[PDB]
Amino acid sequence: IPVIEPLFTKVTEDIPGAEGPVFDKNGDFYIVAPEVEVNGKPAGEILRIDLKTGKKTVICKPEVNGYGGIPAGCQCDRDANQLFVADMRLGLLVVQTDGTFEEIAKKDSEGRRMQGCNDCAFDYEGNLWITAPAGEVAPADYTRSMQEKFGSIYCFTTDGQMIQVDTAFQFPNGIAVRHMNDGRPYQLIVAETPTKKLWSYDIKGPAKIENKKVWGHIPGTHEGGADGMDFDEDNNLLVANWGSSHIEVFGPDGGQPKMRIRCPFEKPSNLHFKPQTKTIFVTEHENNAVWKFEWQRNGKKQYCETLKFGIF
Ligand SMILES: [Ca+2]
Ligand SMILES: [Ca+2]
Numbered sequence: 001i002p003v004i005e006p007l008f009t010k011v012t013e014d015i016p017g018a019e020g021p022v023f024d025k026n027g028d029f030y031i032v033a034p035e036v037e038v039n040g041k042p043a044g045e046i047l048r049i050d051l052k053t054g055k056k057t058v059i060c061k062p063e064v065n066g067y068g069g070i071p072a073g074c075q076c077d078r079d080a081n082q083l084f085v086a087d088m089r090l091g092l093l094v095v096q097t098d099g100t101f102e103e104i105a106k107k108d109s110e111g112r113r114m115q116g117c118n119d120c121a122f123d124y125e126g127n128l129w130i131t132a133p134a135g136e137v138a139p140a141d142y143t144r145s146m147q148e149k150f151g152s153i154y155c156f157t158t159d160g161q162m163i164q165v166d167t168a169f170q171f172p173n174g175i176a177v178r179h180m181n182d183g184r185p186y187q188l189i190v191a192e193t194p195t196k197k198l199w200s201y202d203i204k205g206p207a208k209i210e211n212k213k214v215w216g217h218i219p220g221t222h223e224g225g226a227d228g229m230d231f232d233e234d235n236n237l238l239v240a241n242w243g244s245s246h247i248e249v250f251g252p253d254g255g256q257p258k259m260r261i262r263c264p265f266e267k268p269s270n271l272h273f274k275p276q277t278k279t280i281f282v283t284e285h286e287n288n289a290v291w292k293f294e295w296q297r298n299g300k301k302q303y304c305e306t307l308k309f310g311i312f
Contacts, residue, residue, distance in 0.1 A: 001219075001256075001257060001258075001259065001260055002258075002259050002260070003246075003259070003260045003261070003262055004259065004260075004261055004262065005261075005262045006261065006293040006294060006295075007293060007294075008263065008264050008282075008291045008292070008293045009291060009292050009293070010054075010289060010290075010291055011049070011051065011054055011281065011289070011290040011291055011292050012049050012054040012055075012056060012289065012290045013054075013287060013288065013289035013290070014288060014289075015031060015033045015047065015056070015283075015288050015289065015290065016033050016034070016035035016036050016037075016288055017032075017033055017034040017035030017036075017072075017269075017285060017288065018031055018032075018033060018269065018283035018284065018285065018288050018289060018290055019031065019032050019033075019034055019071075019072045019073065019228075019269055019270050019283055020032040020071065020072055020073040020074040020085070020086075020119070020228075020270060020283075021074075021270055021271060021272040021281045021282070021283055021290065022074040022075065022076055022083065022272055023076065023272065023274060023275055023302075024076045024081055024083065024097065024304070025076060025078075025081040025304055026081060026097075027275065028048060028097070029048070029049045029051055029281070030046065030047060030048050030049070030059075030074065030083065031047055031049060031283060031290060032044065032045070032046050032047070032071040032072060032073070032074060032085065033045045033046075033047060033071075034069075034070040034071055034072045034088060035070075035288075038068070041068055042067075042068040042069060042070050042089055042142075043061060043063075043068040044061070044062065044068060044069045044070045044071045044072075044087070044089075045058045045060065045061050045071070046058070046059055046060040046061075046062070046071055046083075046085065046095060047059065048097075049290065059095075059097065059098075059099040060095050060099045060100075060101055062085075062087060062090060062093060062095075062101055064090055064103055064138060065138070065139075067089060067090070067138040067139065068089070069087045069088075069089050069090045069093070070087055070088035070089045070090075070116070071085050071086070071087045071088075071093070072086055072087065072088055072117070072118045072119065073085065073086035073117070073118055073119030073120050073131075073228075073270070074086070074120070075120050075121060075122050075128065075302070075303070075304075076302065076303075076304040077094075077303075077304060078122075078126065078303050078304045078306060078308065079126075079308060081097060082094055082095065082096050082097070083095045083096075083097075084120060084122075084128060084156075085101075086117035086118050086119055086120045086130055086131070087116065087117060088116040088117065088118060088133075088134045088142075088144075089116055089134070089137060089138050089142060090103060090116070090137055090138055091103070091104065091105060091106070091114040091115070091116060091117055091137045091138075092104040092105060092114070092117055092120075092128075092130065092154075092156060092162070104156065104162070105156075105162045106137070107162075108154065108162045108163060108164050109161050109162055109163045109164075110164065112164070113136045113137065113140070114132075114136070114137045114162070115132035115134055115135060115136060115137065115151075115152050115154075116132060116133070116134025116135065116136070116137055116142070116144075117130050117131065117132045117134070117154070118131050118132065118133050118134070118172070118173055119131050119173060119174055119175050119228060119270070120175065121175045121176050121177050122177070122302070122303035122304075123177040123179070123185035123203065123303070124177075124179055124183050124184070124185060124303060124306055125158065125185060125206065126158040126303065127155055127156070127157050127158060127185075127206045127207070128155070128156040129153070129154070129155055129165075129175055129177060129188055130153065130154040130155070130156065130175070131151070131153060131169075131172035131173055131174070131175050131190065131191075132151060132152045132153065132154060132172065133145045133146075133151040133169070133171040133172050133173060133193075135150065144171065145169065145170055145171045145172075146170070146171050146193075146194060147170075148170070149168045149169060149170045150167070150168070150169075151167070151168075151169035151170060151171055151172040151192075152164050152166065152167040152168075152169065152172070153165050153166045153167070153169065153172055153175075153190060155206065155207035155209075157206045157207055158206065159206075161207070163207040165207055165208075165209055166201075166209070166212070169190070169192050170192055170193070170194055170195055171192060171193040171194055172190050172191065172192055172193075173191045173192070173193045173225075173226060173227050173228070174190075174191035174226055174227055174228040174229040174239065174240070174270070175188070175189065175190050175191065175229070176188075176189045176229045176230060176231060176237060177189070177203070178231065178235060178237075178252070179300075183306075185203045186202070186203060187200050187201065187202055187203060188200065188201045188203050188209055189215060189229070189237065189254075191218075191225070191226035191227065191228075191229060191239065192225075192226075193224070193225040193226060193227065193242070194224075194225055195225070196217065196218040196219075196220070196225050196226070197214055197215075197216070197217060197218065197226075198214075198215045198216035198217075198218065198226060198237075198239070198250070198254065199212060199213065199214060199215055200212075200213050200215035200254065201213075215254040215255075216237075216239075216250050216254040216255055216256070216257075217255070217256055218239070218241055218248065219241070219244065219248070219256075219257065219260075220241065220243070220244045222243040222244055223243055224241070224242035224243025224244065224267070225241065225242060225243070226239050226240070226241060226242070226248075227239075227240040227241070227242040227268070227269045227270060228240045228269060228270030228271055228283075229271075230271055230272060230273060230299060230300070231299070231300035232273070232295060232296075232297050232298065232299055232300060233297050233298045233299065233300055233301075234252075234297060235252040235300065236249055236250065236251060236252070236258075237249070237250040237251075237252075237254075238261075238271060238280070238295075239257075240268040240269055240270055240271055240282070241268065242267050242268060242269055242285070243266060243267060244266070245262060245263055245265065245266045245268075246260045246261060246262055246263060246268070247260070247261040247263060247268055247271065247282070248260055248261075249261065261293075263282070263284070263291075264291075265284045265286040265287060265289075265291075266284075266286045267284050267285035267286045268282055268283075268284045269282075269283045269284055269285050270282070270283050271283070272299075273295075273298065273299025273300075274292075274299075275299075275301075275302070275305055276298065277298060277299075278294050278295045278296065278297055278298055278299075279292055279293075279294060279295075280292065280293055280294075280295050280299070
């Protein structure tokens with residue numbers, strides 16, 4: 001299995017649990033710090049990073065009814081410059097670039113209390129696929145599915161329904177949507193961290209998935225596994241393999257990695273491409289920092305990069 005060692009450049013540091021790297025419609029860069037605490041209680045933050053200096057700015061410190069958040073994953077919206085944030089304590093939030101935020105839902109379409117979320121990914125139709133490795137949100141005592149299988153997957157549809165699409169996962173983490181060349185959503189890829197597996201489903205429509213299958217295998221016996229992921233323009237899937245010092249590269253068909261990228265740190269957590277470039281920003285938990293490196297090709301366009309009123 002070929003392994004490459006590109007040059008990694010430090011961007012910023014001292015960000016507890018550095019996660020959810022994302023770019024907004026204006027090109028601004030954000031990351032979340034889920035592990036920030038205050039007096040032993042969660043006090044996670046959402047930060048904006050100046051890429052020219054590495055200087056940080058906390059734009060939001062989510063809290064609902066006195067319960068602080070654990071923001072861990074992000075996606076930028078298309079029709080509005082706003083961020084969708086998966087929070088391990090608060091569920092799903094919508095955060096404005098000015099710092100104001102709104103809680104999306106306390107319960108799902110079946111009336112069941114929402115579970116804490118970790119990452120999310122939009123499909124080109126505007127539906128948001130979310131992983132939920134935590135137990136019930138906020139007032140409820142914080143729990144996580146690292147040992148027991150209670151992790152779930154949700155779909156937040158364009159018509160505003162929060163539907164649980166599957167459950168019984170052991171820490172569902174990263175998530176990605178594979179699209180056809182015509183732009184139609186085709187498959188959902190979900191990372192199940194401690195089991196060293198990537199799972200796939202065929203997407204038949206909003207909140208409609210079928211044919212669950214083992215899609216890929218994550219190497220190593222180390223503690224950890226697949227965390228965050230994203231596709232490149234050729235539909236290669238790059239997967240942060242937390243605890244292995246590598247980012248695995250899977251081909252469109254999955255299976256075993258076709259290549260591995262060696263990182264100068266043991267805990268890569270999540271990644272994101274800079275729009276219209278081959279530059280990938282990576283967060284890691286060894287140093288709680290953000291780095292960047294050049295890939296072989298550009299990233300796959302994110303939903304926020306597509307056009308609602310586009311001809312082609
Ligand atoms: Ca994650
Ligand atoms: Ca990403």
